[PDB]
Amino acid sequence: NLISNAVNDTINVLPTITEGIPIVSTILDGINLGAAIKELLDEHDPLLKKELEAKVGVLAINMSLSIAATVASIVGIGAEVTIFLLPIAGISAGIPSLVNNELILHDKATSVVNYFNHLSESKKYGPLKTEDDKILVPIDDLVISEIDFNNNSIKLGTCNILAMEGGSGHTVTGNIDHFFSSPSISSHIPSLSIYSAIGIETENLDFSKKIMMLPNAPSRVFWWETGAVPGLRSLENDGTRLLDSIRDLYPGKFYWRFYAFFDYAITTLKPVYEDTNIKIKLDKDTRNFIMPTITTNEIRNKLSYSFDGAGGTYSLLLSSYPISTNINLSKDDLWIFNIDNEVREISIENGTIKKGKLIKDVLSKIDINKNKLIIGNQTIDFSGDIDNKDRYIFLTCELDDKISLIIEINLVAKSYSLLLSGDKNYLISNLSNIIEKINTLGLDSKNIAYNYTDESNNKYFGAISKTSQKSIIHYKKDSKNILEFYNDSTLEFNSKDFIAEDINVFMKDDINTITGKYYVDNNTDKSIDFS
């Protein structure tokens, strides 16, 4: 192989600065990095070239409108998802208690009736409730596929209950059956489903809204007991009609309230939570997702997400409590991960989620691999297309209400880079606090880029050095080039008119470098380059 590539390739060892007529920049520590490498970097942006220039320190900023529009869409999605908040998982139904190591969920008959009353809301509001701009799952309603993004249908898992053995003499009077021998719950004689009694619309659903909360969906079997509780006979006018529907659908195999010799009813409800993996099939659109927060480890550890990889633009708000996740990939994919709930201290005050100040050194060790990215306490698994060298993964966190930090991660090159956003004057005013928050986060990238897209579609391009806090911002306003240089609080340089063409800006360690093309006395033929 070395024989073949040495015959094929020709190496020039004679001392020449330029051969392919660039504008050369041999000043930076005596290195001949000037434009003979930077033209290859700026023409087609190689990932290995960028990663291996990061070890020298060169951050060549990108002024392309595709990159600026991608950064604008990323920061808009992150801003919206960070702005609106949601509670924890089991407020409506769940949060079971661990009593004698069996995970009892509901303790009394009216609580069991209220659980089935909450489960009967899938007939009313469908299998996916809607807020003003978000599709929401019902609590403790499991959905297993959600292929609804492609052909508009979902699939339901198993939420079955234990059956019942035979009774001796059965007569029904006033919708309350009077037994002669009370039948018994059998762990054999296989289980009876509830979702065959709820008629759930699952083949024609509406996804006009593109923000979705992922379900709390483990498959479970409800073990249950039976006590006396002789105080309820007029409760039948409630959401007990679902229990009567299960009774009538399975004749002789389930009876929720009877009169053998005393009154009887369901008292407890013990789930099982067998393993469930949810195979979400995506589509062409720009769907956003929010991962739910589950506060019980025995339910949290039985879940897995298996997103597909059709050619869209997807985001996923990672929760503080981790869920196993698998990502399928393809050629064209833009995956966004919001780590705002990961980089903040998370507390539950009144059932919602309130975020703390920050977490020290939570992103100091970012384990980037070809098929697995580990950030904080979460492991993200990538599969399908793990050999593409032209695909990036973005990590978004809101350092403030205006300035966002976007981490650009490529899996196969094992590299990460930092970008910023927000208003230019606000960023210059709060640059010290922004670099303080980044140092609290623990990132070690010395140069931070800055791409902004303000209102009325004017773009800003920037480069902030963390050491000594120097900034260069170049932007085009009123069809002219403005160039600003800041020593972190003062405008140390300002060219309101900057007559130049093909302007490229990069830094080496703290040395800003601006290159381009100048015309002598506005003559097109008198073209002089400059660095």
């Epitope: 007939k123 009694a197 008629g199 759930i200 619309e201 024609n204 006018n237 009609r241």
Partner: antibody, heavy 123, light 108 residues
Framework: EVKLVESGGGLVKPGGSLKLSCAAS????????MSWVRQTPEKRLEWVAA????????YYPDTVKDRFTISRDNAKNTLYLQMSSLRSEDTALYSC????????????????WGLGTTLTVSS | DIVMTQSHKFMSTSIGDRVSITCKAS??????VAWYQQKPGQSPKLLIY???TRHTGVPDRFTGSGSGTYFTLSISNVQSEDLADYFC?????????FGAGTKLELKR
């Protein structure tokens, strides 16, 4: 989106027979219980019959047993009502309604109503 | 089997008043009573279900109350579009019985 169109209008001799229909679209069928109602002008509304989701159990009052029947076809999203022995008391606006059933067929309110089929019987 | 009687066949009111239509059942039904509103030449629209809560899209003026054999439907502010029929019907038993009728008319 949800519509309930019905086409069974006409005039028949007393003692004869007639068949109604009720199409449905917008929502998936065989998930919701259906029923027929009889809006008389002079008297109040009269529920006449009802069926469950899979067409298992059918409920009638005393004046309807061995007189009327409901057959449901889930493939073509139709709901029928075959009539017999119209003794000059069935002149009412027949409407098609959707119940909030689960599986069994149990007394409920109605989500949507049909527009109405004006059926009258006379000499 | 079960019968259900409504109070007033005809009543009138002015815009800005409050109207309480009362429905009475022969026996106990236990909050299983629904309320409708039939426009002339149009299908009826459900307003109140389980005798206490309102349907999706029903305006906040329609408040229902009652448990047992006495059910009242109340409108906080009568408008021009709130002038139609009003029906009560129990659903605690298989022979469903509807109300007689109550037309809300305008006082001119």
């Amino acid at each position: 989106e949800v519509k309930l169109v019905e086409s069974g209008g006409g005039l028949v001799k007393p003692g004869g027979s007639l068949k109604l229909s009720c199409a449905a679209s917008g929502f998936t069928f065989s998930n919701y219980a259906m029923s027929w109602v009889r809006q008389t002008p002079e008297k109040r509304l009269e529920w006449v019959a009802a069926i469950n989701g899979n067409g298992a159990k059918i409920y009638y009052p005393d004046t309807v047993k061995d007189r009327f029947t409901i057959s449901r076809d889930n493939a073509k999203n139709t709901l029928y009502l075959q009539m017999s022995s119209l003794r000059s008391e069935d002149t009412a606006l027949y409407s098609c309604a959707r119940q909030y059933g689960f599986y069994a067929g149990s007394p409920y309110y109605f989500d949507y109503w049909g527009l109405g089929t004006t059926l009258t019987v006379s000499s | 089997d079960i019968v259900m009687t409504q109070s007033h066949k005809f009543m009138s009111t002015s815009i800005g008043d409050r109207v309480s239509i009362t429905c009475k059942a022969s026996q106990d039904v236990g909050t299983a009573v629904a309320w409708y509103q039939q426009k002339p030449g149009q299908s009826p629209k459900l307003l109140i279900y389980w005798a206490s809560t309102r349907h999706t899209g029903v305006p906040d003026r329609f408040t229902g109350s009652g448990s047992g054999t006495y059910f009242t439907l109340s409108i906080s502010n009568v408008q021009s579009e709130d002038l139609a029929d009003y029906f009560c019907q129990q659903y605690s038993s298989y022979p469903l019985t509807f109300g007689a009728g109550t037309k809300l008319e305008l006082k001119r």
